[PDB]
Design a protein around this ligand. Structure first.
Ligand SMILES: *C(=O)[C@@H](NC(=O)Cc1ccccc1)[C@@H]1N[C@@H](C(=O)O)C(C)(C)S1
Length: 624
């Protein structure tokens, strides 16, 4: 069985050459063109595999159950099962048969047309008919469309009137006259060709993906683009004529939204009469995805940012339903999927504010809002006494002279500061001293009860939140900075709304949900209910007290428990200093809604609190 083992290696190498797409390397392993030998020459075998497998997008040829016996003195027979992936699914349970020849020092394959497909003979052809599948829709929690397939409206003389009509079309549709003449002067433009320019009197209808909210949900939903030849080579089950999700939920849910391509792959005779049907199944359209998003809250949350850098997360904290996931600035997903110029796409990538960033999934330093967690931990382990009054003199403070020139800084010079006063004025010195007295060991014990290091079950690409870089602070300064939300903390707004949901469930952390049909997941006993009933009344005073940092929100006249914060970061690209503004707020009477808004690289005298009056009214009216 020495020459028999060489024949098994020849069959294995022939299949591997077909699997890797190198049809020339597979054809060179066949015998000469003759009777009882190879049916075609090496060059003819190359063109037949390249035409047939290329038309069906065959990829991943895998065989099994190989058996190679011996027939004649110089003829060896082989047989094996095989499976392959085509553009209409996986072809499985294929019985292949053939013979080999070892007329010298090497062993070749007596190639026959039945080695392409099992029942092919002589000059048989292969026909493939496909039916494109309609992409499914993305809807909100009330059925409003967020990503649908609509019918769009896509928008000549001789000499002088032609140039005058171009100037008339550029001024009647807010278009550049230098681009209208550039569209009709492209290399692909032939004399009487309709050159499309932009979508919506006519001087001298097509189907496509449509996003109703547009930029208000561009980071969350995403966009779809034309499928390329490289996309088919990676996944043949795609439609080489349709769309593929490029970012956002259009990409994360691309498999469920695109459906499956339908049609028939059959073998015909020399004349195109069908003989054997290999694959055939009806077209299955893409399923719709229903989100927890509120279409009216998503638009309001985005418009409240006013085009500045920031993000806003609105949830129902008792169930976790993500009502709004806004990010600003944003891009136009309709222009992104229906043709965009090289200048407009470069303007989105070269924009320093980066509109492509999903800021609700980007890890930031939580700021002074994180004092709610440090206080709740201090109340659980008995370190923080709600009535204990610390004496703080001045605006700067340090533990001892070993800190050098670093001092914890506060804004309000209040001499008598207890826990309630610290949350109203956002006193960093108070929380810094209570964190040091708490100790790193007991501080991490309360932090580990949260979602630090956990990857949330959400169709949004993000990194898990962290307490610090390593498992130990190993620095009293870093321990204090982590007390009031600075240091090496990295928590994205979605993870902040999850950690802050304990104050709406009496110490129970409710994980956020984006899909409407998913079951509510929670984590009980994260913080004590006693700490909730102590901090939440103080969070009311952050809005109601006249010296509260969120006193401008008392104008709403609705029950609110809030906590603001303005974290300052080291920018390096700018040595003046960059500060982010944060705001957390929820209804402490019914726990119907919860809001976490931020303002990245804020302007002076600007804050997320100033821009939250509109969204807080809608969430209080429609989510009790
Ligand atoms: C929490 O992050 C605190 N921020 C600082 O100490 C940094 C800072 C604050 C103001 C100006 C420059 C640097 C507190 N959070 C904010 C807030 O809650 O709005 C305060 C201004 C109260 S300090």
């Amino acid at each position: 069985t020495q020459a028999v083992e060489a024949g098994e290696k020849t069959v294995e190498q022939f299949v591997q050459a077909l699997n890797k797409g190198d049809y020339n390397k597979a054809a060179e392993m066949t015998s000469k063109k003759a009777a009882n030998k190879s049916a075609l020459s090496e060059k003819e075998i190359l063109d037949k595999y390249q035409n047939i497998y290329g038309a069906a997008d065959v990829k991943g040829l895998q065989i099994s159950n190989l058996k190679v016996d011996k027939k004649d003195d110089s003829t060896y027979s082989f047989s094996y099962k095989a499976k392959m992936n085509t553009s209409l699914g996986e072809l499985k349970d294929l019985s292949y048969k053939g013979t080999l020849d070892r007329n010298d020092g090497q062993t070749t394959i007596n190639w026959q047309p039945n080695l392409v497909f099992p029942e092919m003979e002589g000059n048989d052809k292969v026909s493939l008919t496909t039916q494109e599948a309609a992409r499914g829709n993305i809807i909100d929690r009330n059925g409003e469309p967020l990503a649908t397939t609509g019918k769009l409206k896509q928008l000549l003389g001789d000499g002088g009137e032609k140039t005058a009509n171009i100037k008339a079309i550029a001024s009647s549709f807010d278009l550049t006259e230098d681009a209208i003449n550039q569209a009709i002067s492209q290399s692909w433009v032939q004399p009487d060709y309709f050159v499309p320019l932009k979508i919506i009197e006519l001087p001298a209808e097509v189907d496509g993906r449509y996003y109703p909210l547009g930029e208000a949900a561009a980071q969350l939903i995403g966009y779809v683009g034309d499928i390329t030849a490289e996309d088919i080579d990676k996944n043949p089950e795609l439609s080489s004529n349709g769309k593929i999700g490029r970012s956002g939920l259009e990409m994360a849910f691309d498999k469920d939204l695109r459906g499956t391509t339908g049609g028939k792959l059959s073998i015909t005779d020399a004349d195109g009469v069908e003989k054997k049907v290999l694959i055939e199944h009806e077209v299955q359209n893409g399923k719709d995805i229903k989100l927890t998003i509120d279409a009216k809250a998503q638009k309001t949350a985005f418009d409240s940012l006013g085009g500045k850098a920031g993000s806003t997360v609105a949830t129902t904290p008792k169930t976790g339903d993500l009502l709004a996931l806004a990010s600003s600035p944003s891009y136009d997903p309709n222009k992104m999927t229906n043709g965009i110029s090289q200048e407009d796409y470069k303007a989105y990538e070269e924009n320093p504010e980066q509109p492509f960033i999903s800021r609700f999934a980007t890890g930031y330093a939580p700021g002074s809002t994180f004092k709610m967690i440090t206080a709740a931990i201090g109340l659980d382990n008995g370190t923080i006494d709600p009535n204990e009054v610390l004496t703080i003199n001045g605006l700067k403070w340090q533990k001892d002279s070993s800190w050098g020139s670093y001092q914890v800084t506060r804004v309000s010079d209040v001499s008598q500061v207890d826990l309630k006063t610290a949350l109203i004025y956002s006193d960093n010195i108070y929380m810094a001293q209570e964190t040091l007295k708490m100790g790193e060991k007991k501080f991490r014990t309360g932090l580990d009860k949260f979602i630090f290091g956990e990857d949330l079950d959400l169709p949004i690409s993000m990194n898990p939140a962290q307490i610090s870089n390593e498992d130990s602070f190993n620095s009293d300064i870093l321990l204090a900075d982590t007390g009031y939300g600075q240091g090496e903390l990295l928590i994205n707004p979605i993870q902040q709304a999850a950690m802050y949901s304990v104050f709406a469930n009496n110490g129970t952390l409710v994980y956020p949900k984006l899909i409407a049909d998913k079951e509510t997941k929670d984590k009980k006993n994260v913080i004590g209910e006693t700490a909730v009933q102590t901090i939440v009344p103080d969070l009311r005073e952050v809005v109601q007290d006249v010296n509260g940092t969120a006193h401008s929100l008392s104008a709403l006249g609705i029950p609110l428990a809030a906590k603001t914060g303005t974290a300052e970061i080291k920018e390096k690209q700018d040595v003046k200093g960059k500060e982010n503004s944060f705001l957390f707020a929820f209804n402490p009477d019914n726990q119907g809604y919860m809001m976490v808004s931020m303002l990245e690289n804020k302007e002076d005298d600007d804050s997320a609190t100033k821009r939250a009056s509109e969204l807080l009214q809608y969430l209080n009216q429609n989510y009790q």
